Design a protein. Structure first.
Ligand SMILES: *[C@@H]1O[C@H](CO)[C@@H](O[C@@H]2O[C@H](CO)[C@@H](O)[C@H](O)[C@H]2NC(C)=O)[C@H](O)[C@H]1NC(C)=O
Lengths: 49, 49, 49
């Protein structure tokens, strides 16, 4: 059914363009990551990985 | 002619099948926050009054 | 990462949430209760008028 919009409509009836981001952060191969600079890898020493 | 806050307009609701989904066009509905009764499945409850 | 963009009315901008019920929230788009991520909303009354 028609979902028209008029500029005379007040708050609660104005159009609201909604975009939702869905994440799947879980044990699975990472493809999207933040801008964290990857450093050299060290072994056999206690490190905050 | 909605009454002033100091003298609020109280109304009695009697035996009726009230659909809380057709009222959505009756107001802008700036805020529809609700307490212990969620409005979501509000049409499946029976009230004393 | 998944993004979904659409438009809804002002009184239902908060209707999109995990487990909400109504018209849109159960007929056009629902978020699962375990949904991780978040929604972005802004008014487009200037353009969609
Ligand atoms: C409180 O209730 C309504 C809500 O504004 C007012 O209006 C009348 O309410 C009665 C029921 O009590 C209805 O039968 C009438 O049709 C309503 N309209 C009119 C024009 O009478 C009612 O007057 C309010 N009472 C107050 C403020 O004392």
């Amino acid at each position: 059914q028609s979902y028209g919009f008029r500029p005379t409509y007040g708050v609660g009836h104005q159009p609201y363009r909604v975009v939702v981001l869905s994440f799947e952060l879980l044990h699975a191969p990472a493809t999207v990551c933040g801008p964290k600079k990857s450093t050299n890898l060290v072994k056999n020493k206690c490190v905050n990985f | 002619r909605f009454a002033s806050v100091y003298a609020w307009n109280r109304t009695r609701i009697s035996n009726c099948v009230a659909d809380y989904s057709v009222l959505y066009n009756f107001a802008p509905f700036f805020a529809f926050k609700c307490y212990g009764v969620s409005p979501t499945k509000l049409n499946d409850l029976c009230f004393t009054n | 990462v998944y993004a979904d963009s659409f438009v809804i009315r002002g009184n239902e901008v908060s209707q999109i949430a995990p487990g909400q019920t109504g018209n849109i929230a159960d007929y056009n788009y629902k978020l699962p209760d375990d949904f991780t991520g978040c929604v972005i909303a802004w008014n487009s009354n200037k353009l969609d008028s």
